[PDB]
Design a protein around this ligand. Sequence first.
Ligand SMILES: Nc1nc2ccn(CCCc3ccc(C(=O)N[C@@H](CCC(=O)O)C(=O)O)cc3)c2c(=O)[nH]1
Ligand SMILES: Nc1nc2ccn(CCCc3ccc(C(=O)N[C@@H](CCC(=O)O)C(=O)O)cc3)c2c(=O)[nH]1
Ligand SMILES: Nc1nc2ccn(CCCc3ccc(C(=O)N[C@@H](CCC(=O)O)C(=O)O)cc3)c2c(=O)[nH]1
Ligand SMILES: Nc1nc2ccn(CCCc3ccc(C(=O)N[C@@H](CCC(=O)O)C(=O)O)cc3)c2c(=O)[nH]1
Ligand SMILES: *Cc1c(COP(=O)(O)O)cnc(C)c1O
Ligand SMILES: *Cc1c(COP(=O)(O)O)cnc(C)c1O
Ligand SMILES: *Cc1c(COP(=O)(O)O)cnc(C)c1O
Ligand SMILES: *Cc1c(COP(=O)(O)O)cnc(C)c1O
Lengths: 462, 462, 462, 462
Amino acid sequence: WTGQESLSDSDPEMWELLQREKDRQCRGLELIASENFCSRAALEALGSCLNNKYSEGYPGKRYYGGAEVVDEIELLCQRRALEAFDLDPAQWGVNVQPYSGSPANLAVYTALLQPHDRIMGLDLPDGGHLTHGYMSDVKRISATSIFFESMPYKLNPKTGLIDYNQLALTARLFRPRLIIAGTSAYARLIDYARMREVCDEVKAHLLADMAHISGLVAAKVIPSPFKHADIVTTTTHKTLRGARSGLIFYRKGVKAVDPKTGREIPYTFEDRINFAVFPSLQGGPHNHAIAAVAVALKQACTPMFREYSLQVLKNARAMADALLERGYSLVSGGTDNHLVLVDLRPKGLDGARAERVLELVSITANKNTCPGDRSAITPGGLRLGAPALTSRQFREDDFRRVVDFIDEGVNIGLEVKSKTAKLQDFKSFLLKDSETSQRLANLRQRVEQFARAFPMPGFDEH
Amino acid sequence: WTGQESLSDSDPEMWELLQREKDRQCRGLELIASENFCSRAALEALGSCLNNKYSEGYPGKRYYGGAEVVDEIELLCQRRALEAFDLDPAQWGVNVQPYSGSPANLAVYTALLQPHDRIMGLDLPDGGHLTHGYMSDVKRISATSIFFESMPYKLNPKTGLIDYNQLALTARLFRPRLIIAGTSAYARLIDYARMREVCDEVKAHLLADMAHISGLVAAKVIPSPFKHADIVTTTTHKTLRGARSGLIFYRKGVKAVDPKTGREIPYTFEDRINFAVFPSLQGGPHNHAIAAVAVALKQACTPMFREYSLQVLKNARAMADALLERGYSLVSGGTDNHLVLVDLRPKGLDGARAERVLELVSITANKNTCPGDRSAITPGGLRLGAPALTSRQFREDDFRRVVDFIDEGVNIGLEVKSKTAKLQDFKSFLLKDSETSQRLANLRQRVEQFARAFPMPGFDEH
Amino acid sequence: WTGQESLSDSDPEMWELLQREKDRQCRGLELIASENFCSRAALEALGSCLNNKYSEGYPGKRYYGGAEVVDEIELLCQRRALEAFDLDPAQWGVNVQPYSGSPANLAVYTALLQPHDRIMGLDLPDGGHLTHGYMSDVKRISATSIFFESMPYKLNPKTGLIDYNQLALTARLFRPRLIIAGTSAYARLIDYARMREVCDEVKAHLLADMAHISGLVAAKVIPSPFKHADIVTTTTHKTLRGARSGLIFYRKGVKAVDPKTGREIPYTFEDRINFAVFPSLQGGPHNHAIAAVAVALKQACTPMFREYSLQVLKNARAMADALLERGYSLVSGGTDNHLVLVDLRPKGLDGARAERVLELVSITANKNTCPGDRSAITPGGLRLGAPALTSRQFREDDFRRVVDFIDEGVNIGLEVKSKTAKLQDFKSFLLKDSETSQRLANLRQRVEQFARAFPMPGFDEH
Amino acid sequence: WTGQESLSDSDPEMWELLQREKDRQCRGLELIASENFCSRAALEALGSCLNNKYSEGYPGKRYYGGAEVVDEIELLCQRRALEAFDLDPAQWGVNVQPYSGSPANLAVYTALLQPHDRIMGLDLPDGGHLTHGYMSDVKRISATSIFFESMPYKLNPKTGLIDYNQLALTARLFRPRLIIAGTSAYARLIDYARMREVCDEVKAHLLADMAHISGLVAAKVIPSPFKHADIVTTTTHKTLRGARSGLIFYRKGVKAVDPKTGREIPYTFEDRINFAVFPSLQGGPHNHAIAAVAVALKQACTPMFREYSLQVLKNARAMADALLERGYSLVSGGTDNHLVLVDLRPKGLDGARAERVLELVSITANKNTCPGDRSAITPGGLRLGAPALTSRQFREDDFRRVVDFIDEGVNIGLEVKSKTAKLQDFKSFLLKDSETSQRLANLRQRVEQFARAFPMPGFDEH
Ligand SMILES: Nc1nc2ccn(CCCc3ccc(C(=O)N[C@@H](CCC(=O)O)C(=O)O)cc3)c2c(=O)[nH]1
Ligand SMILES: Nc1nc2ccn(CCCc3ccc(C(=O)N[C@@H](CCC(=O)O)C(=O)O)cc3)c2c(=O)[nH]1
Ligand SMILES: Nc1nc2ccn(CCCc3ccc(C(=O)N[C@@H](CCC(=O)O)C(=O)O)cc3)c2c(=O)[nH]1
Ligand SMILES: Nc1nc2ccn(CCCc3ccc(C(=O)N[C@@H](CCC(=O)O)C(=O)O)cc3)c2c(=O)[nH]1
Ligand SMILES: *Cc1c(COP(=O)(O)O)cnc(C)c1O
Ligand SMILES: *Cc1c(COP(=O)(O)O)cnc(C)c1O
Ligand SMILES: *Cc1c(COP(=O)(O)O)cnc(C)c1O
Ligand SMILES: *Cc1c(COP(=O)(O)O)cnc(C)c1O
């Protein structure tokens, strides 16, 4: 046994599952706003020998030895991270060891906040993520609501935008020490200048969790949160189109000048955050992922990525306006980023029903709670994403054809809402009914034909 | 753009770093007990297309759709995890989603404990990991000691073994709710029966952290902690030779019963463990790693793995006895697993000077706090591991000459510890001198030429 | 030494200070809304042999023995407590061991809330007390903000009333587990029905801290909070006119009927609260104070107390309307209880200046932050109280004469605001200036003559 | 109405209870180590007019005005507190505002500690108070163990003394921030030098809870804890024979210094202690109690108090030796302060049966957990105190016959413990029987006739 034999001969059970998943990505219309297709160059670094190195510590501050090469790799990733976002190295440092986006956000809270300290993020049904301190009316869901007392700020349901007025009002009463300026399901631009004004008043840090929009920020196609944020977290996949990991951008330099003393007061983020990632929360970093992050980061500084992110915005608004003409309403009217929020309620269907419909025809979308409905009620909306297909060289009229395939799916589900009463009656009827099964199969085959014709990043085989 | 271009074509700067690290892994004698060289079969699954599937949730209880293929990959990983350790799927469950070993320990704490609940782990200078609630006299280090109240149990300084009697009394006073039977530097077996003894008396949970010895337990060599531990956490690399991920095994079924209780009291660990990983602490799973650990988990059930595993212990005694027969005392006198705990205080050197002179000759080890270290600044001990090199087909005689370079390394470091008083002047002499550099430059060529013969698991170029 | 010799012969230094304080109360116009003059019957029980009994435990559940008489005393106080507030013993129990009002409120939080659990009380500059979880923008002031995470609700400055709308809105976002419905500086009636609607929605307990208005509630001259509150705390002095202590009224019986099961769900307040007072927070109760509380409680159920509390309301509105005619504005227009909130800002003086002015003429009032000013700015208002003078048989035209003495004091301070610039210049000028000293002395003597003519509860001597 | 009517005139039902308790105090032999009969001088100050002054704040830093007389009463109490214990007003301060002893301990914790900080006190079965962080295996009891993390130190079961060596090791593991040298049931002195030994090593505070021995320290009999303890808390009753209140003595001035530190490191306990009492935990001070404890504090400096104090220890040895010379073993073998720790396991009875038979004969004691109690249900030991009866001019021969009734009491309880198996059947036999009732009814008449001769400090009727 040498360990150098291919997976096809070593584990045929898993190598088959690898090809079955690769076919699902090639034949399906991946419409989930958070999903992207990683390039082969990064995946070659993700599954490499760098797995075999315990580089506990930091470049130049390693607990072990033999970290000669991984130091150059970890340092290059930091330089490529700051270069991709046009950050000045004297004003910005970056940690590249967060295992994913969720451990990245908890690292920032652990670094700058005591247990039970207060944070404020957008509510989960309003568009914020779990890691922004989401808790329900019965249970503390995210561990961010357990180790820290979180109060969410909500949207204004009349406009679908963030209620920046109610945020400033409740921040004065709640007195949070950290406010999250980032979303998971939000089709509009976050007013980071308004977030900083609130944070400057209540003496709170401004964290920008740009996971969904990091690629657009790196391409400078949307306003960059670094102009106002103190700490900036992001996943390394999604719009960045890299391996699953996370980054933590922090301000280094001088915070401000002393008022009555006239003295430069420094920033104390680097050593607090770098200590929170290790040895507080994590252990040995995944140098294979760090390298893969660096490969995708190098791709972000290229005119290729500027054109790709630009096409994402064009595809998203092309998908938005196409949805509007067919009779669909959208949260906040349309989109200014990479995703659109469809409101299926004025069309007679809920997101939980339509997502199962689209899932059976290889169209992976996700239900979304629309502004107004009290969360627990079956979500009457969907969240659609552009970066996934755009990575496969999708065009505007290609996304317009995507909307056509959704219009057929919604109508198929609409005919089942009349033939059924409950959601599980809806789910089972889609599989057991004779006529409804073949029309789902016909739409699926027509979807898979159109989807397979486009390219696909990564390996041909897996 | 395509995304299917090679790494050597698109990013040459990163491709050279990949080979420089692979050549460094081949040219050296990796002796860190936590390191291991993963197989190519898992590296093909690690850098696969599964990085592009947000499968948040659990099989059958997914948050999205299109999780058709990733579900059976997680369930095959769950089945292979219980099968490798010979666990009844009716008595044991597993979570295959923890990003690494450190997130696996934080998850079970959040699952079964409240903030500031009492935990007890082995002290880091005594051989415990950070994740076991390592607290200092100066500061809180691990987040396990920040979000939870931790009191460490120590070793017997005269025997070098865990002071089970001191633990038995301090537990009745500290009144912990969970005790960790983990090990990062302890060359003998842990009386899991005596730890269930203490955990049942103080009514606490017994969690086994077999991350360092997990393949030795999978190969049914050393006794298995699953007889006693209610919960078992593990890293997927180290002894199992897999990708970097984590596992959380938990007892499920029936705890006890009583005719007074009416029926049976069930094990309620499953839902708590799973909820703690997602949606509490983590988010989107790294199913590309889950696939790679499923690959290595199937390898763990093979007759080859037990053959490889037994050689690790045989090389452990080979390294221990050869070190003993050269003027080196060992903590607890020898080894009984995969690692060896040297004591360099007799030889005349310390751990910090030795791990640097040995790292400068492609023999990577690590510092270790030995029982009786009169100084915390510079510890007098290393820790050398068998699993790393044994994966390159290392017999007992192969390890018996790796200690020859070691003994030559410490003697070189001994002939400068007198020439140079302080460590920072020590470290500066190994490269500013014309003689000591030649002394080390010639040692590692015979060291790299000896290492390069054995084949390296994984790819050839990277 | 027998210990039975009087204080006059034993400690002449303290017996003189006793008579000097008694003269200050007899000669001064005690206008502090929280102050009252305890009767001699209660003071005879406050300074009695009951001090010498350690009655740790509860009637029938004593840790010691010999509690035969103090059990009858503690039980009679409970019966007189429930009788004074027209409470049904099957619906209401009461704890009589809180040392004061502040330890009473912390007992309720400790009983029903975990550490760092959330509460909501009126902000301190808005009228709420410290024990309602007051914290500043720099420091956690009250220990209620340390052991529990408190968010305050504020008044509506346009009307001076409690912002019941903003309270309901922020309660949904903050999700508190206990809401305080009680004030220290608030001249209007609390809408307990609206408080219960908010608490019923966010699944929170409704605590009514009726310390300032307990006597008015016992006389049934204002709406009783027991109609809506779950737990009711109160000091035993103030409007109750008793010895310094506290009570905790809790609902006993059935909370509600099971919705889907049809079953009576009990109240679990008694044993949680009684355990929080002892042995959690306190030790041996002050049986001398408990007895004194019972003496004053017996007086509360009498037609005398109904007439006294009625005269308090008449005196307060007589003081209010008198203040209005002289050109003074009042927060929320006037008063519906025992105190008025004067706004001195439209008259050219602040409360910090006027209170020092009135203090030098034996008129003890307190400055009050008026709705609008950002707390730290020198308070431009005063809080005036009726129960203190009304206990001395003050009439409406007597309080109208009280307002005349305040009008002279304000005008004396107004002439110093022009002659000074800072607040300490104001304070020192009142004492060192020749002309300003005699006019303060003339007003003081005229105040002390008019004040000494009225009766005074308690002993003649001390 | 007037308010100056007598208690016997207005409330006769309460006046009869006052005499029934006073007659019970006179007719019995109070032997509880925590009880004491306060002097009339302090009872006149306790039930004085100072109950009617909200003096929130501190002298010179009051929140209101009119605090002219109450300020010098608090400062005289502060001066008398330092003078009684011979404390330099430059090295020691005092807070005379804690409502009782239990609030005094909670205040200093809030002053110097954060929530869930580590504290260490004597276990309650070993002789520690609740306020020392008493935690059980089943539940958290004292709020000191809820709001703070507590680990108890134990006694040596073979010696009956504090296990200073077990404390010395568990402290290095628990890493506490404050250790309490308090005692509720421990008849020997505490090595405060050896506790400063441990507190200086683990860098923790040393707080002395001399509540039980405070007058013995004031009379300069037993050694004073003020030599070592950084902070000292105390109850104003018990050994000092004062009203029920609390005191918090704190070291102020200069901690240490260094030529490297430039100047001197000052003691920063004063502002933390004072702020914790008000405005953190308490509110309006009970200056009527503060006056009464100032009365008894002046008595503590008299040559009479030292004469009274010495008799307490002389009566302690008298009670201990007489008990030893009658077939009673004592914990640690005798006494060296004010209390005695009997061990009734040799005699044949237990604490629960003995404290009831003795309470039924006007000899009030208390249960006590003796080292080696094979059952927690029924402890085998009482605790009898000298300070209570010594305040009635009890010589050594007077106490030597109080044990005669005790020995007669335990023998009566011994002759029924065989007649009645279970305790609830035991307790029922002392009143349902015609013989045992006569056995006890005749014993207490000789017991009450013996007690009634000695005069009672305080008033005559109440
Ligand atoms: N805008 C936004 N869109 C998305 C899309 C995906 N995500 C990631 C988070 C997905 C998620 C959210 C909530 C729960 C959850 O609470 N599950 C409990 C319910 C129990 C109870 O609530 O009582 C259960 O499974 O039982 C689980 C997973 C986000 C996000 O974070 N934000
Ligand atoms: N037996 C055992 N062996 C090993 C081998 C590797 N590891 C994992 C890493 C161990 C480790 C311990 C401490 C720190 C650290 O950061 N220490 C400084 C703070 C830094 C500063 O700012 O100077 C401090 O303590 O102050 C980092 C890593 C283990 C383990 O956990 N256990
Ligand atoms: N409506 C209302 N009226 C009254 C009237 C009396 N009280 C009782 C409470 C009085 C009180 C309030 C606040 C502080 C305080 O904070 N002092 C710090 C400031 C430090 C900082 O804020 O940074 C210091 O002394 O330095 C102290 C005492 C109340 C009440 O509770 N409510
Ligand atoms: N050495 C020492 N001697 C004495 C003498 C008096 N005291 C002060 C009071 C001691 C005390 C201890 C325990 C409880 C208690 O409430 N126990 C139950 C819960 C009740 C239930 O619900 O059954 C439980 O533990 O479960 C109450 C009081 C002390 C002291 O503190 N120390
Ligand atoms: C390897 C290991 C871990 C996990 O470390 P990571 O760097 O997070 O993979 C935890 N505990 C012990 C004892 C270990 O050996
Ligand atoms: C996508 C996203 C995440 C996901 O974090 P993972 O650790 O990758 O699951 C978290 N937060 C926000 C705001 C996101 O947009
Ligand atoms: C008396 C005493 C206290 C205070 O008890 P209270 O009932 O609150 O007065 C605290 N600790 C010890 C050791 C005591 O002896
Ligand atoms: C008067 C008042 C208090 C005072 O409590 P004390 O313990 O007596 O100082 C507390 N809370 C409220 C709401 C009050 O009105």
